[PDB]
Amino acid sequence: LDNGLARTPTMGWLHWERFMCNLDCQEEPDSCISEKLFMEMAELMVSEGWKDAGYEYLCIDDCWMAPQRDSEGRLQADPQRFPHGIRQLANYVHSKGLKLGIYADVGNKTCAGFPGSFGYYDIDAQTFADWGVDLLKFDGCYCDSLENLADGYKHMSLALNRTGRSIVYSCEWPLYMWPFQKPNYTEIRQYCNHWRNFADIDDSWKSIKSILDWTSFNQERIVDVAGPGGWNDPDMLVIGNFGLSWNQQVTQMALWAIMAAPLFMSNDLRHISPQAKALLQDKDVIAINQDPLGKQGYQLRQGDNFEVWERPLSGLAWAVAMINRQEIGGPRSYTIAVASLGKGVACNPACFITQLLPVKRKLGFYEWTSRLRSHINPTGTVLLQLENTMQ
Amino acid sequence: LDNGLARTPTMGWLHWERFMCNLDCQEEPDSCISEKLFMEMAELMVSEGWKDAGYEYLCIDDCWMAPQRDSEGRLQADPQRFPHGIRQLANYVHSKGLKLGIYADVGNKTCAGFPGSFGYYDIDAQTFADWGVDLLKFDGCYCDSLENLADGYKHMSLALNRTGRSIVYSCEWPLYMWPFQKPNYTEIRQYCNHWRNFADIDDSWKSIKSILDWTSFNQERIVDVAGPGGWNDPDMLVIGNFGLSWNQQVTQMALWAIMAAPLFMSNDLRHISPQAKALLQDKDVIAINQDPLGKQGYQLRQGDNFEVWERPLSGLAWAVAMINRQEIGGPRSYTIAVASLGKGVACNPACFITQLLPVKRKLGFYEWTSRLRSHINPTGTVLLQLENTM
Numbered sequence: 001l002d003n004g005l006a007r008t009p010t011m012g013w014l015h016w017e018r019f020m021c022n023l024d025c026q027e028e029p030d031s032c033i034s035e036k037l038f039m040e041m042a043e044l045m046v047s048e049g050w051k052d053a054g055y056e057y058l059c060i061d062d063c064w065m066a067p068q069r070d071s072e073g074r075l076q077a078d079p080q081r082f083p084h085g086i087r088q089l090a091n092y093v094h095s096k097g098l099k100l101g102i103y104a105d106v107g108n109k110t111c112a113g114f115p116g117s118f119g120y121y122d123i124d125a126q127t128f129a130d131w132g133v134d135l136l137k138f139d140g141c142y143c144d145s146l147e148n149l150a151d152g153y154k155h156m157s158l159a160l161n162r163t164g165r166s167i168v169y170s171c172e173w174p175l176y177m178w179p180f181q182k183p184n185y186t187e188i189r190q191y192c193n194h195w196r197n198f199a200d201i202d203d204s205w206k207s208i209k210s211i212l213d214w215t216s217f218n219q220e221r222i223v224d225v226a227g228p229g230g231w232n233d234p235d236m237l238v239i240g241n242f243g244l245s246w247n248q249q250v251t252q253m254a255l256w257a258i259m260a261a262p263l264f265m266s267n268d269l270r271h272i273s274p275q276a277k278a279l280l281q282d283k284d285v286i287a288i289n290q291d292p293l294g295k296q297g298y299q300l301r302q303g304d305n306f307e308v309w310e311r312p313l314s315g316l317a318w319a320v321a322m323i324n325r326q327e328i329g330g331p332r333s334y335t336i337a338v339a340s341l342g343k344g345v346a347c348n349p350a351c352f353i354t355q356l357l358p359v360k361r362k363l364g365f366y367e368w369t370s371r372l373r374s375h376i377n378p379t380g381t382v383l384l385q386l387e388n389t390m391q
Numbered sequence: 392l393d394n395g396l397a398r399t400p401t402m403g404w405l406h407w408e409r410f411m412c413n414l415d416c417q418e419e420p421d422s423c424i425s426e427k428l429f430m431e432m433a434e435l436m437v438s439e440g441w442k443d444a445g446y447e448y449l450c451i452d453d454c455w456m457a458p459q460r461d462s463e464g465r466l467q468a469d470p471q472r473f474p475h476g477i478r479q480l481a482n483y484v485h486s487k488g489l490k491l492g493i494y495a496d497v498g499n500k501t502c503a504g505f506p507g508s509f510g511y512y513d514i515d516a517q518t519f520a521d522w523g524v525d526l527l528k529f530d531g532c533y534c535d536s537l538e539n540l541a542d543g544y545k546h547m548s549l550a551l552n553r554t555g556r557s558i559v560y561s562c563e564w565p566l567y568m569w570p571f572q573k574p575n576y577t578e579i580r581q582y583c584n585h586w587r588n589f590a591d592i593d594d595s596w597k598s599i600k601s602i603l604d605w606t607s608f609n610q611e612r613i614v615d616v617a618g619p620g621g622w623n624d625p626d627m628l629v630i631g632n633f634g635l636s637w638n639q640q641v642t643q644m645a646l647w648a649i650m651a652a653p654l655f656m657s658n659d660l661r662h663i664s665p666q667a668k669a670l671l672q673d674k675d676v677i678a679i680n681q682d683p684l685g686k687q688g689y690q691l692r693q694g695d696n697f698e699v700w701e702r703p704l705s706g707l708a709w710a711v712a713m714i715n716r717q718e719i720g721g722p723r724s725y726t727i728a729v730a731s732l733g734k735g736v737a738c739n740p741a742c743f744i745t746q747l748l749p750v751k752r753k754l755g756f757y758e759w760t761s762r763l764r765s766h767i768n769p770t771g772t773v774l775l776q777l778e779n780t781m
């Protein structure tokens with residue numbers, strides 16, 4: 001989308017994976033979708049270094065709405081759970097130097113069953129702008145017509161544009177197309193800042209794997225369309241929760257960097273380990289994800305339960321990720337000629353290699369003819385940065 | 392098996408899951424299957440408090456053997472990887488106050504392709520005893536008939552008894568017949584100290600779930616047969632490795648205690664996190680696993696992606712495990728009437744409840760009228776001990 005936004009992949013926090021549609025503020029007050037949760041999350045984003053690391057957007061997902069629209073046909077926040085409204089929540093979020101994301105649906109209802117935007121695209125977009133919304137995640141439930149789907153996503157794109165407000169437009173367009181036909185990604189890019197391609201992530205290694213496998217299987221269709229202002233969205237970072245081992249967390253962080261993915265954490269910032277925090281706030285890994293060239297990476301190689309991915313970076317630098325997909329035994333050695341990396345450019349005539357994950361370690365100078373030898377933990381990833389050099 | 396052994400589930404370390412069949416001592420001398428590897432583990436079992444916690448059996452799995460039997464028709468350890476021989480390794484292990492387990496196969500070859508014991512059961516049994524072996528894991532590969540399988544397991548059982556040496560007998564009997572026939576567990580128990588029921592574990596949460604799910608589905612057939620001298624074997628503890636989250640590791644530790652399972656760690660004792668070590672060495676949790684009553688727990692309830700398992704203990708105590716099987720969202724509230732726990736006797740008229748996992752915390756007195764309220768992490772388990780108040 002040519003709106004001047006998402007020139008690098010968007011970074012922030014989104015409630016969905018970790019908090020979902022918890023409406024029970026009486027028996028689950030700490031977990032329910034309330035203005036208090038978003039306020040408290042905003043406070044920790046500032047005080048715990050998240051904003052400094054680049055996580056700017058505090059995002060509300062589904063289940064913020066009142067059951068019905070008001071007497072004007074405008075959306076309302078739930079009166080019991082958001083008694084002060086979205087306007088004052090946005091004011092609060094902006095005073096902390098952060099931005100506010102919200103959620104709506106192209107069909108007649110949201111996925112959770114709250115008012116949908118069909119028939120209200122212009123009204124809904126304007127009320128978001130009036131409230132001071134900075135990002136919109138637009139879902140695709142309760143829309144069984146292919147025509148309506150495309151018309152809605154296109155309509156809402158222009159509807160937001162006409163407000164004069166700078167709002168990041170996050171679409172689920174391609175994901176809801178697959179049941180009907182293969183998406184036109186050139187068209188989606190024209191209208192969206194980023195787009196969900198695949199099924200919702202959950203708190204599991206199974207889910208990370210299925211997202212990676214879908215991406216690599218479909219990469220010839222999606223890689224080259226990504227770039228400044230328009231990114232593929234493989235869904236939320238789920239590091240800091242419950243279902244991933246340390247190595248599986250490393251794999252997600254490393255690969256979301258390779259993929260030029262928007263980085264939306266879905267976790268609890270009030271209850272997060274020092275280890276998960278350090279990984280999510282890793283300067284060098286975030287710098288890869290945020291590289292100004294904006295070229296999405298890809299799977300270079302697969303075989304023998306190993307995967308090699310690489311991403312071209314600015315200044316003839318490259319990020320290389322090696323995944324060990326064997327889920328038995330111990331660390332396995334993998335060797336590769338550096339000439340095979342970065343299309344033969346990264347290390348011609350030499351490169352300086354620095355391991356970034358699982359730990360940061362300078363590996364030294366590698367001649368074009370030389371071999372890189374490494375060891376990779378089961379379900380883990382080794383992430384390397386290659387710096388082209390004459391030295 | 393009435394040999395006076397495995398009166399509580401066997402505890403130790405077994406190389407298989409973590410170290411596999413690595414024969415590359417040239418490129419990987421620190422992780423290949425060798426005498427050195429077992430010496431290093433033996434030292435750490437003593438020095439790092441594993442033996443103190445109850446882990447007594449240091450066990451060799453497959454890939455210790457030379458390609459062929461010696462000139463006398465006996466099994467021999469690989470001459471390069473085990474240069475001093477097994478008898479010498481057992482001498483060393485014993486001097487450390489530990490016990491040595493080894494591995495053989497009922498068929499014509501082991502699963503990795505080394506000499507099988509079919510036709511050599513009496514020689515092999517006597518060889519093991521002579522070496523000072525304290526445990527045998529007896530695999531089921533390359534056995535062409537169910538009759539040969541049953542006969543071999545019975546034969547080796549009797550052959551070990553005739554040596555006069557106390558040797559724990561670990562069988563894979565039921566696992567290898569399950570595809571073809573329902574096992575007779577009364578019969579297996581008569582011959583074995585513990586028995587593998589289900590597919591090999593690996594370093595994954597998928598695997599833990601499969602094992603748990605198989606066990607709860609088959610519990611009517613397997614729970615009551617277990618007891619002192621004969622245990623169901625759901626396979627190795629894989630805590631301390633790479634594929635399990637903290638909460639998934641807690642689930643394995645807690646449920647292996649509920650199941651009265653043998654506790655064979657398969658990990659790298661040289662490279663293990665303090666968190667993993669503390670869990671594996673948890674006194675209170677080990678004590679449940681090791682309860683002298685030896686009554687295997689069972690799944691009590693299943694619904695809304697929650698499972699409740701319980702185990703009767705000595706002196707009118709019970710262990711209760713609550714698993715959260717939903718793999719999305721956050722810590723999830725579960726409640727149950729305490730009157731539904733422990734067959735309605737655990738908390739009549741009252742019980743004191745202590746949470747053991749994920750952390751140790753006294754919950755207090757619960758009347759027979761009470762409800763137990765808990766928040767359980769996705770893929771995690773809450774493990775409790777109930778003491779009847781009298």
Ligand SMILES: *[C@@H]1O[C@H](CO)[C@@H](O[C@@H]2O[C@H](CO)[C@@H](O[C@@H]3O[C@H](CO)[C@@H](O)[C@H](O)[C@@H]3O)[C@H](O)[C@H]2NC(C)=O)[C@H](O)[C@H]1NC(C)=O
Nearest residue numbers: 001002003004005157158160161162163164165166167190
């Ligand atoms: C509503 O839609 C229009 C049309 O796409 C948007 O205007 C476009 O804005 C972008 C960026 O603001 C302009 O692209 C270029 O910006 C770079 C900045 O580095 C500059 O070097 C180039 O000279 C160029 O201006 C683009 O020209 C412009 N498109 C048109 C046809 O005017 C607009 O931003 C949308 N939303 C809003 C906030 O109104």
Ligand SMILES: *[C@@H]1O[C@H](CO)[C@@H](O[C@@H]2O[C@H](CO)[C@@H](O[C@@H]3O[C@H](CO)[C@@H](O)[C@H](O)[C@@H]3O)[C@H](O)[C@H]2NC(C)=O)[C@H](O)[C@H]1NC(C)=O
Nearest residue numbers: 392393394395396548549551552553554555556557558559
């Ligand atoms: C070979 O097999 C025989 C027979 O199955 C085993 O003998 C059994 O040994 C156990 C434990 O040593 C005996 O149980 C014990 O009985 C005494 C009663 O005097 C009691 O004080 C102990 O608490 C315990 O219950 C069991 O009775 C005995 N069975 C028979 C029928 O004699 C023998 O141990 C096996 N030998 C080896 C080396 O495995």
Ligand SMILES: *[C@@H]1O[C@H](CO[C@@H]2O[C@@H](C)[C@@H](O)[C@@H](O)[C@@H]2O)[C@@H](O)[C@H](O)[C@H]1NC(C)=O
Nearest residue numbers: 497498499509532533534535536539540543
């Ligand atoms: C062990 O093997 C015996 C002989 O096996 C025969 O020769 C080998 C090379 C194969 O080709 C096989 O098909 C032949 O039967 C068997 O008599 C015996 O049953 C085997 N024992 C077990 C338990 O598998």
Ligand SMILES: *[C@@H]1O[C@H](CO)[C@@H](O)[C@H](O)[C@H]1NC(C)=O
Nearest residue numbers: 106107108118142143144148
């Ligand atoms: C929403 O409902 C209207 C009227 O009931 C219907 O005509 C339309 O098909 C629905 N909209 C979408 C986009 O599914």
Ligand SMILES: *[C@@H]1O[C@H](CO)[C@@H](O)[C@H](O)[C@H]1NC(C)=O
Nearest residue numbers: 183184185186187188189190
């Ligand atoms: C995809 O959509 C774009 C923009 O609407 C258009 O230029 C192109 O023809 C479409 N591609 C195909 C093959 O339909």
Ligand SMILES: *[C@@H]1O[C@H](CO)[C@@H](O)[C@H](O)[C@H]1NC(C)=O
Nearest residue numbers: 574575576577578579580581
């Ligand atoms: C099971 O095995 C035991 C011991 O061999 C025997 O007493 C019993 O008859 C067997 N039962 C069945 C169902 O075959």
Ligand SMILES: OC[C@H]1O[C@@H](O)[C@H](O)[C@@H](O)[C@H]1O
Nearest residue numbers: 219220223224298299300301
């Ligand atoms: O999307 C581009 C990529 O396409 C892959 O199929 C190919 O193996 C890579 O070399 C890379 O060029």
